[PDB]
Write a protein that binds this ligand. Structure first.
Ligand SMILES: Nc1ncnc2c1ncn2[C@@H]1O[C@H](CSCC[C@H](N)C(=O)O)[C@@H](O)[C@H]1O
Ligand SMILES: [Zn+2]
Ligand SMILES: [Zn+2]
Length: 883
């Protein structure tokens, strides 16, 4: 009936060659070949448009049909060229992009375009079901072209019926894709919506002649019938007559590097750290400069200089495990797992969103409750035990050669390994120099080195996930730390003996008995919620409450300890890698005064201590001790210790805290909603509504702690044992990954057998895990030594790292030293040990009963012998499970 319905009717009536003639007829395109080579390789620093949209926004803004500023929201970001051209715009200060991705559709692409430090993209977002947020610049490139206009209209109508909820929160500028602007109902809806919110409709000539797509933009204004008739008229005319020529233009060059950002960081205490700062400038004043494009909000930018890049994102496959696990070639949770990006880029694109935050300063009443509980806990812990200066002897006793250098200055660049340095008196001479400087109150060398951690983690966007940062000091600074405070890890201040709540050292075997004994305790439900990024939530108040143990020290120990505390913990200086613009990489040096590193000696101890303080505070709030105004200021300060010395240990042995993670069994169910002191301290719950009640649990077998839930199993004879478990796909993926680049197959099979014996030792109750471990240990030479690390948990001591038989190892760890199993009778055979329940094994990620696992299990000897043949025959193998 209309100029558009008739044009679309003609466009459908054509054939494939008339289609090809008309599609590109008379528009402008972009010289996209440069950008598409940089994308073929993945060259982020090239600074090219990831899409053709970058030019559509370039045109819509540069012609002046858009007035972009402030906080931007890209709806349907797809790759993200719109978001990436937004990051370049001067008045923009944060760009949020949302997309769906997944199967078939476009996952977000990560580049180094100018301003990449303000770009947060997510996938798996059906935006119709996303709530509204008040953005300053609204972007919607969400359209879905088709042959029949009946679905074009409905899809644009659903698109608008969604974006209106967003637009009624008044953004300053907008650009929304309009796929069908040419039908009766669409003309009606466009007129009514232009009246109710403003704006104007523009057709872009870069856009193909094959869709009626127009854009609803802010800085422009025009009538709907007029612009639509303009577009349909011109489209109808370009069909007949001359096939008119294409106009070439060049793609917008986005640039590269970070962007100048809000710097609301606290001023530095210059005289604590100035020695180290000016030492670094005196050492690297050659290329010393200040980059204005620091993407640091909560860190004090102190400068940068050129440096070499470290790490990679490449992930190699362990073919032993993979070829033996051919049926897991399908599960996404297994094959999508890979390595973590430890490059400067991969470290910073996690840094700018996980570390560049500033904690709310808890109120003084919560501050006083924190200090009260911390002092009471220092008293109750330092009751039996008392501090002591750790010795250089114990330091070299615990040390081994696989530690990290921390090579910062020229005086520390001699050695290559740890054991090489520990027996050289020049080392202890510089240590004594820094110790006497610490006693005088000046820090020269205690500087933090930082980079991303190499982890075996789930892949995101079908790519390598960004690496969480780890930052450690110089071994001499770690020695000063140890002589001051390492007594907390040495003397087991956190062991369940002295504390009651902690479990410092206890392996994953006994912890299930701790859970059973805690479940036998009556009360409410069991509440175990992980804390979001523990190290980043630590405040100065938490640190100053931790510095209280010094009350029980002597004068020299307290001098060294408080010197290191104040010059190291309460004042931190860091050296990090950052990808500079156009290839080059730089090292920046920054500073702050709160949070804590995972590279500290007493990381586990400090995490467990402040976590227990918080749990005590939450049990006080749950059991109504702390009133609602007491966040502001403390009323009746006595009744805090009145409850501490009446129920402190009583509620304390109902706790299991291990650094980051925690488990509590309170008195009643109110613990689920005692969240106000918890939120005020800066210790929020990870990815759950900040005020929603906590999810409790009843059956202790289904409680997670340190990535494991435990199960009780009766033996085939009668004894009762408690075993750890997690999802099978995670362990299979971790084993499938090879951490190292360039390792010989001998050592890769060493890792294969390491994982194999780890499974035989821990996850034997999983049918596939024991089966595959027997198969790996079979096809792998029992000669070679297991090397490498499996799971980074400190509760994994490393018991499967020997060619000794796992049956004997099993008897020793589960019966002879089993403190919670009295019967010392060692069972003699493998198949006497029971599996997990059929249903519970299937639930924890097992593939039993399915035809691929059946097929692979019947050809197991074929495949294992294939493995032996590939390694190299006439090596000493062993045919482990036969039944
Ligand atoms: N409902 C939805 N929510 C989020 N993303 C969607 C979506 N529907 C489609 N998408 C994705 O968003 C893309 C829209 S085109 C993306 C253009 C982008 N703004 C640019 O800068 O060039 C599609 O490829 C599709 O995969
Ligand atoms: Zn120092
Ligand atoms: Zn389980």
């Amino acid at each position: 009936e209309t100029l558009g319905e008739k044009w679309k009717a003609r466009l459908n009536q054509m054939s494939a060659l008339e289609f090809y003639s008309y599609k590109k007829s008379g528009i402008t395109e972009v010289c996209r070949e440069e950008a598409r080579r940089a994308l073929k390789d993945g060259v982020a620093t090239g600074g090219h448009a990831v899409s053709r949209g970058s030019a559509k926004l370039r045109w819509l803004v540069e012609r002046g049909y858009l007035q972009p500023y402030g906080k931007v929201i890209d709806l349907g970001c797809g790759r993200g060229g719109w978001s990436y051209y937004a990051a370049t715009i001067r008045k923009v200060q944060e760009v949020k992009g949302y997309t769906k991705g997944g199967p078939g559709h476009e996952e977000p692409v990560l580049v180094q375009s100018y301003g990449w430090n303000i770009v947060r993209l997510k996938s798996g977002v059906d935006v119709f079901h996303m709530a509204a947020e008040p953005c300053d610049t609204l972007l919607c490139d969400i359209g879905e072209s088709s042959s029949s206009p009946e679905v074009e209209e409905a899809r644009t109508l659903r698109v608008l019926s969604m974006v209106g909820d967003w637009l009624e929160k008044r953004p300053g500028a907008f650009c929304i894709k309009v796929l069908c602007p040419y039908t009766s109902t669409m003309m009606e809806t466009l007129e009514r919506l232009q009246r109710r919110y403003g704006g104007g409709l523009v057709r872009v000539p870069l856009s193909r002649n094959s869709t009626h797509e127009m854009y609803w933009v802010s800085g422009a204004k025009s009538n709907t019938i007029k612009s639509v008739s303009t577009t349909s008229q011109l489209l109808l005319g370009r069909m007949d007559g001359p096939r008119r020529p294409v106009k070439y233009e060049e793609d917008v060059n986005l640039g590269s590097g970070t962007r100048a950002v809000v710097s609301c960081a606290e001023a530095p205490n210059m005289k604590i750290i100035g020695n180290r700062i000016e030492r670094i400038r005196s050492e690297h004043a050659e290329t010393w400069f200040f980059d204005e494009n620091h993407p640091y909000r909560t860190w004090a930018y102190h400068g940068s200089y050129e440096a070499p890049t470290q790490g990679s994102a490449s992930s190699l496959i362990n073919g032993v495990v993979r070829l033996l696990s051919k049926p897991w070639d399908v599960v996404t949770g297994v094959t999508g797992i890979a390595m973590t990006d430890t490059t400067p880029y991969g470290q910073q694109r996690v840094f700018k969103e996980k570390v560049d935050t500033r904690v709310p300063d808890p109120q003084e009443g919560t501050r006083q409750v924190m200090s009260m509980v911390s002092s009471w806990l220092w008293k109750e812990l330092g009751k039996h035990k008392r501090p002591r200066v750790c010795t250089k002897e114990e330091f070299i006793n615990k040390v081994r050669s696989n530690a990290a250098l921390g090579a910062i200055f020229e005086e520390e660049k001699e050695w290559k390994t740890a054991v090489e340095a520990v027996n050289d008196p020049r080392f202890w001479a510089l240590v004594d120099k820094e110790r006497e400087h610490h006693l005088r109150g000046e820090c020269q060398s205690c500087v933090y080195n930082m980079m991303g951690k190499r982890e075996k983690k789930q892949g995101e966007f079908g790519k390598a996930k960004g690496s969480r940062a780890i930052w450690y000091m110089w071994l001499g600074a770690r020695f000063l730390e140890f002589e001051a405070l390492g007594f907390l890890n040495e003397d087991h201040w956190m062991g369940r003996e002295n504390s009651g709540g902690g479990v410092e050292g206890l392996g994953l075997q006994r912890l299930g008995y701790v859970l059973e004994e805690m479940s036998r305790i009556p009360g409410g439900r069991m509440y175990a919620d992980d804390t979001a990024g523990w190290d980043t939530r630590i405040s100065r108040f938490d640190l100053e409450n931790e510095a209280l143990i010094t009350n029980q020290m002597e004068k020299g120990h307290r001098a060294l300890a408080l010197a290191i505390i104040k010059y190291t913990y309460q004042n931190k200086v860091v050296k990090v890698l950052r990808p500079a613009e156009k290839g080059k990489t730089v090292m920046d040096i920054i500073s702050r005064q709160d949070q804590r590193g995972s590279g500290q000696v007493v990381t586990y101890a400090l995490n467990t201590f402040t976590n227990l303080v918080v749990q005590l505070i939450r049990n006080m709030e749950a059991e109504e001790v702390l009133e609602m105004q007491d966040l502001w200021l403390l009323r009746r300060s006595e009744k805090v210790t009145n409850w501490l010395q009446s129920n402190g240990w009583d509620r304390l042995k109902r706790m299991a805290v291990s650094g980051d993670d925690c488990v509590v069994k309170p008195i009643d169910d109110r613990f689920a909603h005692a969240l106000r002191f918890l939120n005020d301290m800066g210790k929020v719950r990870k990815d759950t509504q900040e005020w929603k009640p906590s999810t409790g649990w009843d059956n202790w077998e289904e409680v997670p702690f340190c990535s494991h839930h435990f199960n009780k199993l009766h033996l085939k004879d009668g004894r009762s044992i408690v075993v750890p478990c997690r999802h099978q796909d995670e362990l299979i993926g971790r084993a499938r990954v090879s951490p190292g680049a360039g390792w010989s197959i001998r050592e890769t099979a060493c890792l294969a057998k390491s994982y194999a014996q780890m499974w035989q030792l821990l996850y034997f109750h999983r049918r596939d895990l024991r089966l595959m471990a027997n198969a790996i240990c079979s096809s792998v030479p029992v000669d070679w030594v297991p090397t490498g690390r499996t799971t980074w948990s400190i509760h994994g001591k490393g018991e499967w790292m020997t060619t000794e038989d796992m049956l004997v190892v099993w008897n020793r760890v589960w019966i002879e030293e089993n403190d919670h199993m009295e019967d010392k009778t060692p069972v003699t055979k493998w198949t006497d040990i029971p599996y997990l329940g059929k249903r519970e094994d299937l639930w924890c990620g097992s593939l039993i009963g399915h035809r691929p696992r059946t097929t692979w299990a019947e050809n197991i000897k074929n495949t294992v012998n294939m493995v032996r043949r590939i390694i190299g025959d006439e090596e000493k193998y062993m045919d482990y499970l036969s039944t």
